Design an enzyme around this catalytic site. Sequence first.
Site, PDB file in Angstrom:
ATOM      1  N   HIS B  41      -6.745   7.183 -10.413  1.00  0.00           N
ATOM      2  CA  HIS B  41      -6.926   5.860 -11.055  1.00  0.00           C
ATOM      3  C   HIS B  41      -7.137   4.584 -10.265  1.00  0.00           C
ATOM      4  O   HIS B  41      -7.080   3.397 -11.368  1.00  0.00           O
ATOM      5  CB  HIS B  41      -4.544   6.156 -11.036  1.00  0.00           C
ATOM      6  CG  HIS B  41      -3.916   5.573 -10.260  1.00  0.00           C
ATOM      7  ND1 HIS B  41      -4.178   4.626  -9.224  1.00  0.00           N
ATOM      8  CD2 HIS B  41      -3.707   6.534  -8.864  1.00  0.00           C
ATOM      9  CE1 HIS B  41      -3.454   5.095  -7.722  1.00  0.00           C
ATOM     10  NE2 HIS B  41      -3.453   5.465  -7.471  1.00  0.00           N
ATOM     11  N   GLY B 143      -1.552  -0.891  -2.496  1.00  0.00           N
ATOM     12  CA  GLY B 143      -2.857  -1.035  -2.103  1.00  0.00           C
ATOM     13  C   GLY B 143      -3.414   0.288  -0.723  1.00  0.00           C
ATOM     14  O   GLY B 143      -3.743  -0.222  -0.520  1.00  0.00           O
ATOM     15  N   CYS B 145      -2.671   3.008  -1.991  1.00  0.00           N
ATOM     16  CA  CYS B 145      -3.240   4.303  -2.537  1.00  0.00           C
ATOM     17  C   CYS B 145      -4.223   5.204  -1.412  1.00  0.00           C
ATOM     18  O   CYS B 145      -5.395   4.247  -1.606  1.00  0.00           O
ATOM     19  CB  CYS B 145      -3.382   3.852  -3.745  1.00  0.00           C
ATOM     20  SG  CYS B 145      -1.643   3.777  -4.862  1.00  0.00           S
TER      21      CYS B 145
HETATM   22  O1  LIG Z   1       2.689   3.307  -7.422  1.00  0.00           O
HETATM   23  C1  LIG Z   1       1.625   2.520  -7.007  1.00  0.00           C
HETATM   24  N1  LIG Z   1       0.891   2.269  -6.077  1.00  0.00           N
HETATM   25  C2  LIG Z   1       1.840   2.670  -5.267  1.00  0.00           C
HETATM   26  C3  LIG Z   1       1.713   3.446  -3.878  1.00  0.00           C
HETATM   27  N2  LIG Z   1       2.210   3.212  -2.843  1.00  0.00           N
HETATM   28  C4  LIG Z   1       3.720   1.809  -2.343  1.00  0.00           C
HETATM   29  C5  LIG Z   1       3.763   1.056  -3.258  1.00  0.00           C
HETATM   30  C6  LIG Z   1       4.761   0.431  -3.346  1.00  0.00           C
HETATM   31  C7  LIG Z   1       4.712  -0.736  -3.564  1.00  0.00           C
HETATM   32  C8  LIG Z   1       3.856  -1.419  -5.042  1.00  0.00           C
HETATM   33  C9  LIG Z   1       2.898  -0.145  -5.785  1.00  0.00           C
HETATM   34  C10 LIG Z   1       2.960   1.035  -4.874  1.00  0.00           C
HETATM   35  C11 LIG Z   1       0.740   2.203  -8.553  1.00  0.00           C
HETATM   36  C12 LIG Z   1       0.914   1.324  -8.983  1.00  0.00           C
HETATM   37  N3  LIG Z   1       2.582   1.542  -9.378  1.00  0.00           N
HETATM   38  C13 LIG Z   1       2.506   2.231 -10.605  1.00  0.00           C
HETATM   39  C14 LIG Z   1       1.547   3.601 -11.005  1.00  0.00           C
HETATM   40  C15 LIG Z   1       1.904   3.985 -11.485  1.00  0.00           C
HETATM   41  C16 LIG Z   1       0.928   5.726 -11.245  1.00  0.00           C
HETATM   42  C17 LIG Z   1      -0.088   5.985 -10.247  1.00  0.00           C
HETATM   43 CL1  LIG Z   1      -0.298   7.290  -9.819  1.00  0.00          CL
HETATM   44  C18 LIG Z   1      -0.171   4.566  -9.647  1.00  0.00           C
HETATM   45  C19 LIG Z   1       1.088   3.797  -9.920  1.00  0.00           C
END
Ligand SMILES: O=C(Nc1cncc2ccccc12)[C@@H]1CNCc2ccc(Cl)cc21
EC number: 3.4.19.12
Lengths: 299, 302
Positions: B41, B143, B145
């Site tokens: 992603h 961030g 990820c």
């Molecule tokens: O979840 C995600 N990131 C994060 C990952 N971990 C903790 C977070 C905490 C707070 C904000 C973001 C965070 C990303 C971004 N939001 C939609 C989304 C949808 C699908 C996918 Cl695969 C990635 C993502």
Amino acid sequence: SGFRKMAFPSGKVEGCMVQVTCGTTTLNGLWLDDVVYCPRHVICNPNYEDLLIRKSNHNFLVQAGNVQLRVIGHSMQNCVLKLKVDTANPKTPKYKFVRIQPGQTFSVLACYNGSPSGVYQCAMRPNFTIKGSFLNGSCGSVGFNIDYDCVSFCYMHHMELPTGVHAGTDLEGNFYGPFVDRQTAQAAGTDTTITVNVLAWLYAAVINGDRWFLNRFTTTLNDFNLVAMKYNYEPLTQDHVDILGPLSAQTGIAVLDMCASLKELLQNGMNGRTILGSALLEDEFTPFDVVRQCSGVTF
Amino acid sequence: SGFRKMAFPSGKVEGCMVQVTCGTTTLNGLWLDDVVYCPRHVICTSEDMLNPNYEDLLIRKSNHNFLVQAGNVQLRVIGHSMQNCVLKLKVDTANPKTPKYKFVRIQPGQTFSVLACYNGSPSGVYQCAMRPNFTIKGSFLNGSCGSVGFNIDYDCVSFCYMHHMELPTGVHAGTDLEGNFYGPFVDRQTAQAAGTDTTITVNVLAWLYAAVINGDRWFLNRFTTTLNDFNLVAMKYNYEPLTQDHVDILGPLSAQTGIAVLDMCASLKELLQNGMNGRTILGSALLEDEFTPFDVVRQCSG
Ligand SMILES: O=C(Nc1cncc2ccccc12)[C@@H]1CNCc2ccc(Cl)cc21
Ligand SMILES: [Cl-]
């Protein structure tokens, strides 16, 4: 989201762990530049000046991985033995020796035979013990913090008290607490809860969406301390109130307002409810740990 | 003595963390030999996140679109391929700090250490378990990820998890290092919910043995149970069924403490019925399920 008991990345400290052997005793050493620091009881009613004078450099077998370091000198500073070696550790990070206060937290790199087996976070209890996880051979394992790129060594493990708690020194060999490094009757004093840390953890719970414990009430610092003293809680000082300022600003809950929540939690309990997956009030996260974890500071 | 939630030393994994940038998106990558692994992603925008066609988006990218940074050094991407939900970026330099490693896919209940990173820089290390609903209860901000989960058994690093997303409930979902998600989750902003979580029964039993090894016996009782009667009771408290494999795995701890697995099962049934009554087990007022039978043995013996 999420709140975890999180330790500093141990990599900078792993590159310093060595095995120190003297006679039958084998424990861990901290190799920084050309010195290996380790508990002085590796030479063992002990008279350490007398025992050390009888030792020569070649009695100390220092092993850094599969390489033997040669000891060229030895001196004692309080309860720590300083073994001068011929080779300066190439992996020596930027470091400081710092003595911490009760309530402050640090990461422990538990080692056996100079090899790191695990890393965990813990707090210096108000009774100067640490509730660690240590077996025989862990002596010489170190506690540290990282501030930017500097490793602050704050603890070196020496012993386990009869209650399962641990006692150790700073890196200058000065024990935390009223302990001595010998086999004798020693007991940890009655422990207390680190109040400023519980409040910081209550702010972390608010930041994570846990608000059930919040209430409309506030308290004076004096009324809070009278209640806190009744429940074996450490007195909350104005310095603690000031340190909680950023969290108070971020969540919109005044420190004395959060104290009224803690006051109610102590007199009434959790009532089947939990805060951050815990049925007990957590006191091993400082106000800085909460800020660092809920902001994501890197090292 | 003592029982702590203990993570593996993160040093071997720190030397693999790099920052991966593609357009506006910046996340973490795992640099092993001449390959940087990262969530696929990273090629997406937030407007191409509900229904991204990753084969289509990746074909439009060239090597120079991926900015990989290892410390204060920029690595040169010389190739890119996608394996399931992970992007594999071939680089022109092999990581000199590459440890002995394996990619392992774990089962629910297994524990691992997480090296949480932001901008290719490690900020912390913590221990956690793969929940039975295939989510992890991590501590992750935007961030994070590309942050990885691992076990360091002996001198080999077993990478078992790569963080991809946070579900609406605050729990996290990710993949193994082959890009296969744990759970019925997809790397899409579509409506996704974690299934009802349950307690890892075999891990609670292992933690009860750790407490016995540490001198805590107050919860023990004169009763035993059949495995069937235990599971009928356990199910009612949202506990995972205990299998014969779990009973077999608890064998060494049963031998060490002299308390039969089905005997410890009867303690757990009683704890579920009564609660702790103001008491704690290993300094906890709740039953802990993020220590496997293997973690208990390792921490209490070696
Ligand atoms: O979840 C995600 N990131 C994060 C990952 N971990 C903790 C977070 C905490 C707070 C904000 C973001 C965070 C990303 C971004 N939001 C939609 C989304 C949808 C699908 C996918 Cl695969 C990635 C993502
Ligand atoms: Cl597994």
